[PDB]
Symmetry: D2
Subunit: 332 residues, 4 copies
């Protein structure tokens, strides 16, 4: 009858022992909490990564590793839970969403503020529900579980870093709420069969410039950010996508695009969509070769350039692809 | 008995007309003659429409300076100031003015609207009304920002949405809540008196780097963003202020701070404090920006870099609370 | 393309002035604030009731008066706004919903906590949006408009009153929300056309007992509350509709129903649906009121008992959804 | 040295097993062999399962006495108390006990769950876990109610929601504490405030209390029925800030009832909100007829407080006076 879920423990506070360190093989020993072993729950095999990943020290090499680990255990399990530290969890859910082509089993990224071995750990409900959702409400996407909500991976962001840290999906509601009862949202289908075959697209680190507009921002600052080896650039603009109108800035952008640098425009407001292309913001930035990133998070936007540039596609394809919806990262 | 408020209409969709919305020479002033604003329980107000109007997306520190001077010139003639502004860079202007003003002894409330005043169901109606009434009747002597029925401290505020435009104050409660009854927050005092003479400190554009950290971010792109003429660097890092261990990036921040570039550390998160300690970033000369918003840190750096100060002075003062812009 | 809306000022704070009262004809004198006399707003005719109704002294006779005034003007106008005092607003609106048959124009009940004539009256918005929503988003129901939401009349309840009066629809989302934008709910239809001639069914006062159940409540107390003339009883029980398993008490209820007393089971919780079937109350004759509000149970009972129908007809129609007042 | 908490499993879904739901003897006790409850930073605990088990909807003031008496008997053996209880009348119980206990110097936390502990992802485990933790590490010396991750004053509480999503609020008092990722205490709420006299339990017995909900047109004939003997008290649920119909005849009945010793307390039928019979807000019609204000009391605190006072052998006026006095933080003014 039962399902069997694979737990990749890559790192994060969830598995540490207090007095506050990472400790070899402890997470597997803890998981003698009987609630993990009811017949209602699924079977789990756990793999502690070696070396264990510290979340702020991660790189796309680490993404590749996680990807590959999932690719190797793809056929052997019904679903997957990736334990991971909070700091760059959103970045990892995001990168994985695009690396996985035709994902047809659930992959759930989770973790905790408070190690699983302290009393009142948020890791308990987190792991328990991640396992349960993977088993009884499979959504074949990379998702991110936290705060009693399952959020689409490439839609999530760390909201707070506080006594109460949290993640939100500011431009898409959560796919599912883990309350007293589990409520699938409306736009969600359980166990969507994908078209073709599952494959892991590789990913190598990419020189991306990220740059926040601010009043009077100098074209020399922008210029500098666009020097080799930068192959892409995310502009964080005002409101529904307004940059300042100084000529020499727009010229620095235009020239960048003509050397083959992609320039994406995301808004700097938490919730919000860039509206380029006519009435809302005029044509200055489209004329300079800038493309709209829609309501994309910076995490999504970053992962998605890493994904496309890590292929061997022409400038114009990467460009075109940035602008189609590949894994629910954005609408329009 | 009666208060008289100065309304500077600097720009912004509130004073605009419907089209297919653009600007129309002195319509706010005519329009602002509907009876609710002329009422013995309201203050008197005078309005000055800026020429040329300012487009919010296109503002510079020289625009900051024009607003700051304009208040300076009218400081002694009014009980308070309301500055109408478009929403796109409202948080920046308000942050900016909080530092330029020294010993502010009268409310300055920056507000605006997402729908022009002339239209049905404008939010600008209630924003201007409560702004005025608050200025007059609940005067907080700071630079403040009023939107979505709340007054926030100006240098704490952040445009958070962009079809229901909202401003939040993520790391500090609103100073005041303007619902059916006006409710002031407990850590807030009315008409706190200034201890010295009110002054405007100038502000000029500074070439500040604002880099966002991401997994595997290369030292070479960081290097590029620290080239001349950059004089200060805001790093947006993860969580409680964690950066990547990698030596080659650290070495590049240290090099930058050693040649006199201010490197400040803020969190990417909508709320939370950087907490630095044995610290890689501290050793490389990076300083904590605690819980400041990006708008605040950017305003503070402009303020300080536009004074005639040494590197160690700017560095020491960026870590002291100057206008309530951060805690710790 | 301009609609014409009838405003019945039945009474309430919205039309008054301050003191340490209401004044004859002040409302209509107030209504000349230019925001109402603009082409994007409907035209209106206001009627002040003489005498003016006090919300807390209302009776089913006052309901009938309101219903007939609306009947008398039904063909003349495009939609109707009823101004009313907050205390029993939800009662009136629930009542009207049943009394009106084949309603084909909107009827919005509203008022305010502060008189329209004072600083920062909520009356302004409520009256502006009521009118605007009747004209531009006509929903052919008796609806109730407060706190920026249009709720179904027979679903609404006054949740707070102190210095922040408020209404909620705890068991049905608002039909329409009035923020900066108007947002309709999904299963709401704009101007749904009715299938027959609009008529008003009459209402008369009925002796309904309400019993709030508590631990140890005595059957003797229950019996006295069921004495003639009571012809119906609303029982407020616990959780999903649970009563004590006390047989003397259960015996008192069955005697009542044996004599022709309709007894309905409602929950004590603000949000909640009764869920009954061998259920001991069903065998006692008690029927389910599902998720009805107390105001809806009462309105529906007056409506049904005022048509002098059989006990079995009243009992059967209580379990049928007549006006969207309950989810089965 | 660790604390020791006494758990009284009086009844309710938390200690049951599912079936084709049923109560089952000693299962709550069997289950509390879950290692989460047995760790150094948890307090010791002894559980007593009631026999017979109580069903929350059938509860009686006799049942309240039983619970109070059980606590009293165990009062010195332990450092705190958790009462497991079914949700339907959990608020009436918590209320009752607040008045029954006099000079309580030890936490009493009533809690429960929608889902039995044995059922997967029950709310029971967190509710009992933290009730226990809060009792021992954050003792508040009052009768409190723990649900939806918040601890509320027992006599400020009520069951606001019943469904898949059942819940309790104190509409008129902020919760005393919040059990999130971090235990968070309200301000002007003290940990371990010692009382001013020896702990004692005061008796309670059933009282014929009438409860009237005004609606427009409500006839004094139905109100006459509600005042017939044996009724010795009467809760009047009125509109907004405490306003009645002011039909003379109704004034007269209420006056006639108070004149032969029936207590008549005016509460609001609004959820959050407070009765103001000072004179300006509502006038004095109701005051002149002898009705007294229950300010912002819940019905449940109100039924409770009347049962407390009418069960002592106090005079009419004394009960009247005491109903208007704050005895256990149940109201303000």
């Amino acid at each position: 009858a039962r399902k069997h879920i694979y737990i990749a423990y890559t790192g994060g506070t969830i598995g540490m022992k207090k007095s506050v360190p990472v400790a070899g093989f402890m997470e597997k020993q803890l998981a003698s909490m009987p609630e993990f072993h009811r017949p209602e729950m699924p079977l789990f095999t756990i793999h502690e990564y070696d070396p264990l990943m510290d979340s702020s020290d991660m790189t796309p090499a680490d993404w590749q590793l996680i990807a590959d680990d999932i690719a190797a255990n793809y056929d052997k399990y019904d679903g997957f839970v990736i334990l991971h530290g909070t700091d760059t969890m959103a970045y990892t859910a995001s990168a994985l969403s695009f690396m996985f082509e035709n994902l047809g089993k659930p992959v759930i990224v989770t973790g905790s503020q408070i190690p699983l071995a302290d009393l009142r750990s948020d890791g308990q409900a987190n792991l328990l529900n991640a396992l349960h959702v993977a088993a009884n409400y499979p959504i074949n996407e990379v998702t991110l579980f936290f705060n009693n909500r399952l959020m689409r991976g490439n839609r999530s962001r760390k909201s707070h870093a506080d006594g109460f840290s949290a993640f939100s999906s500011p431009n898409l509601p959560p796919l599912l709420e883990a309350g007293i009862n589990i409520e699938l949202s409306t736009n969600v289908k359980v166990d969507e069969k994908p078209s073709g075959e599952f494959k892991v697209n590789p990913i190598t680190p990419q020189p991306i410039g990220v740059i926040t507009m601010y009043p009077g921002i100098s074209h020399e600052v922008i210029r500098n950010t666009l020097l080799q080896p930068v192959n892409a650039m995310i502009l964080l603009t005002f409101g529904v996508g307004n940059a300042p109108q100084n000529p020499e800035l727009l010229a620095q952008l235009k020239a960048a695009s003509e050397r083959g640098v992609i320039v994406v425009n995301l808004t700097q407001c938490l919730a919000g969509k860039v509206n380029m292309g006519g009435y809302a913001t005029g044509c200055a930035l489209a004329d300079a070769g800038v493309i709209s990133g829609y309501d994309m998070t910076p995490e999504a936007a970053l992962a998605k350039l890493h994904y496309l540039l890590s292929q061997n596609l022409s400038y114009e394809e990467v460009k075109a692809k940035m602008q189609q919806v590949l894994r629910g990262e954005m609408t329009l």
